[PDB]
Amino acid sequence: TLPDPLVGADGTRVHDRATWQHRRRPELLQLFAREVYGRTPLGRPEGMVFKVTTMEHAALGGAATRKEVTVRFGRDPNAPSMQLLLYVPNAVIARAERAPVFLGLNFYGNHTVHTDPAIALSARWIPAEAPNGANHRATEAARGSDAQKWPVEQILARGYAVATVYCGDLCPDRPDGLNASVASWLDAAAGDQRAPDAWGAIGVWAWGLSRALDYLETDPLVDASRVAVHGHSRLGKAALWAGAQDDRFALVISNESGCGGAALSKRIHGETVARINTVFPHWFARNFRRYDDHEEALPVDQHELLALVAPRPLYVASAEDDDWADPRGEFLAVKAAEPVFRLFGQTGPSGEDVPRVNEPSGGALRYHIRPGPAGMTAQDWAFYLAFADEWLKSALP
Ligand SMILES: [Mg+2]
Ligand SMILES: [Mg+2]
């Protein structure tokens, strides 16, 4: 049984956009922070420094300008940093125009999103499952290893820049990774035990996405008011939490984000709260473990995280065979979030059951399910590019 997003914590009905934006949204953001992801301890830190390390105006055979940027989270050269890779379509900037952007984290390093041999190899810890890794270190053989999730050339040909950062720059995806992370520097309390409401990897990954947006605001080649933040699976959990917390993001795409992302936790289908916390104890707050095999006690569910994107366009998508993510749970979260989008005059999927494969449904709140297993395919990206065409042609007032 789901909590109503349009009934406030004190029982009062939310009938208007101002009550939603200025009372209900903060209420919900604090519940997710305390009980699920942990508290984001600060937004933009003082002293952000942006250093363009490489700049090639004829990348991808002339189709793109490629930028690599060190985004340091403080002015001292000893503060932590992340490495941002950016491809911008030369066709747009040759017209004296700023390109809209797709921004998303990657799983195995910037050098894996494209075979482009001029990308810096990540100098960070790489997980064991990464293709062609030599003892947790990037290798030349890993180049383009994950390019099937990154149709860079097609995205650029449709008029969008592509920005990415390796999630492991922010928090290595391993159970001890928070100790080697922004979190270890940022909320570096004198103590050692992680506090019960301290953020984990998803919170730290999300914060990195907002810091990448800070960089895009300074880059004259891109329009930072037209940024679609996207992610696949665990990095899609991060894209949703980033897009919910930071309403600068123009559009939000959740590709098969599953448990603790778009899927309802109270459905108890596929991956559950207990299973995700037991396998990935660093992803959520320790407080989220209160709900292991007790999802009935959750004071929110993930439809309210989706509602936190409203009125900005939100795309939630599933893969038919990806039962672990609970595709029907992701769809029903979209349906339970729709009344908030409707409050703002937007439309969600028509229907009470999962649509047929490869038949997207909904207006600014959109869903599709595609055939096959978990992944981020050319078919997913085709639907996202049409979505962005419709809801990200926003360079006019
Ligand atoms: Mg800009
Ligand atoms: Mg589930």
Numbering used by the authors: 35 to 431
Lines from the paper:
Glucuronyl esterases (GEs)4 are enzymes able to cleave ester linkages connecting lignin to glucuronoxylan in the plant cell wall. GEs belong to the α/β-hydrolase superfamily and possess a catalytic triad common with serine-type hydrolases. OtCE15A is an interesting member of CE15 and the α/β-hydrolase superfamily in that it features acidic residues at both the canonical and noncanonical positions (Glu-290 and Asp-356). Here, we have investigated by mutagenesis the residues involved in catalysis and carbohydrate binding in the enzyme OtCE15A and, furthermore, present a series of structures of OtCE15A with different ligands, including monosaccharides and, for the first time in CE15, di- and oligosaccharides.
